[PDB]
């Protein structure tokens with residue numbers, strides 16, 4: 001029944017609110033003037049101003065900020081995954097596998113919520129770092145954030161809300177195509193139910209947006225590429241800057 005799928009949509013929406021302290025709605029209210037206005041970092045000079053509001057050099061301090069935020073996201077996505085009906089019933093190794101790979105794709109989906117064509121919200125929405133400033137960082141650093149902005153600009157064109165994102169990120173975690181997956185079928189049965197709920201949710205929430213379901217699934221291609229490029233750049237920094245490496249979770 002469709003009434004059963006509506007209950008799954010509400011349950012995923014509630015768990016998303018409980019797990020993610022910074023929603024798209026909060027982020028959009030900050031970015032549009034509705035919630036307090038953020039301090040804008042567009043300069044190396046303006047960066048020093050935001051430090052007393054509220055690692056050696058600028059590009060390195062920003063990089064460790066990204067790594068710190070990545071860990072928090074891993075923690076919050078892990079907490080959310082436990083609530084997906086069927087997730088915790090799966091084999092211990094599979095749970096770990098679905099998270100190990102699925103986490104990178106969720107991070108970039110949810111990071112789009114904090115972005116517009118000209119910048120990104122930082123420090124729990126208190127700040128706003130411009131696209132131009134991030135791009136101007138000394139190489140190889142001033143390269144990593146640019147494709148996330150590229151995906152965000154196009155991903156935000158879908159005009160999704162938090163209730164759509166809750167179901168969409170559930171689909172990501174439950175993908176039966178991960179390396180080292182022992183029992184593929186139980187994962188696919190969960191995903192089938194999730195996709196059914198996502199389909200209904202998009203038809204009810206965006207009734208005028210023709211083929212948004214087909215449009216949303218195609219975006220999974222864009223995610224996989226940004227992950228590859230991120231891992232590729234992560235190796236460069238690991239060899240050039242033999243300093244601070246990945247956090248236990250980040251490893």
Ligand SMILES: CCc1nc2c(C)cc(C)nc2n1[C@H]1CCc2cc(-c3ccccc3-c3nnn[nH]3)ccc21
Pocket residue numbers: 061062065066067069070073107111114120121122123124129
């Ligand atoms: C919400 C911010 C965020 N979450 C990220 C996740 C999940 C993944 C990746 C790859 N990057 C992430 N970022 C980037 C965007 C630009 C920026 C600036 C900073 C930053 C720069 C200078 C000073 C402070 C901060 C800061 N600290 N805490 N939040 N922002 C830290 C992080 C980041």
